[PDB]
């Protein structure tokens, strides 16, 4: 299925994914497409911060959903 | 009066507003223009997060001010 | 050495620096190139918000590192 990821650089990136894909998997796809290290990526869906070990299914992310890519902030 | 709203991508939206307008009103204006649900919009002025029930004049947002539209981050 | 800085919208700035440069020094370099007042700059490295009185060395920022500008948020 496809989802879309909006970047601060003004891009909408289409990704081919499955419900069972982890957020880690999605970040790896973004690295392939956009060259951004996964450890600097934060994904947002309807305001919610998506955790690496959860799946798209876990967040009820369905076909043609839009995510936003923002900078991951860590503290320290 | 006019204010300017910069999106995450740096696009400037020009809005016709009034000093007594609420932030909720301004977000409705962005929805009508851009189709972003107000629920998903966060506005920032000079670093400060703007609350929906307060007015532009409450925040000393004057003619020709610039706001930033960012994601309305939430738990869950 | 050289480092890179990404603007709010992902433009890349190249800076000449030394390890002993303070973050305040870096922000002055950014002001000279981009015009952004230092008091409005917030720099991130490895997800961490950088403090003006600390140095690049203090953050283990080495040659060819990338920093990001993000919107400077405040309370009130
Ligand atoms: Zn499969
Ligand atoms: Zn957006
Ligand atoms: Zn009126
Ligand atoms: Zn700004
Ligand atoms: Zn970046
Ligand atoms: Zn020197």
Author numbering:
A (entry chain B), B (entry chain C), C (entry chain A): 1 to 76
Lines from the paper:
We prepared the n-triUb and n-tetraUb in native and cyclic forms by in vitro enzymatic reactions and chromatographic separation. In the cyclic forms, the C-terminus of one Ub unit is conjugated to the Lys48 of its most distal Ub unit. We first compared the 1H-15N HSQC spectra of the cyclic forms of Lys48-linked diUb (c-diUb), triUb (c-triUb), and tetraUb (c-tetraUb). Each of these cyclic forms gave a single set of chemical shifts, indicating their symmetrical structures. In contrast, the spectrum of c-triUb was significantly different from that of c-diUb in terms of the chemical shifts of the peaks originating from the hydrophobic surface and the segment linking the Ub units. We determined a crystal structure of c-triUb at a resolution of 1.33 Å. As expected from the NMR spectra, c-triUb adopts a three-fold symmetric structure in which the hydrophobic surfaces, including Leu8, Ile44, and Val70, are partially exposed, distinct from the closed conformation observed for c-diUb and c-tetraUb. It should be noted that c-triUb was not suitable as a model of the closed state, because of its exposed hydrophobic surfaces, which resulted in a significant chemical shift deviation from the straight line, as exemplified by the Val70 peak.
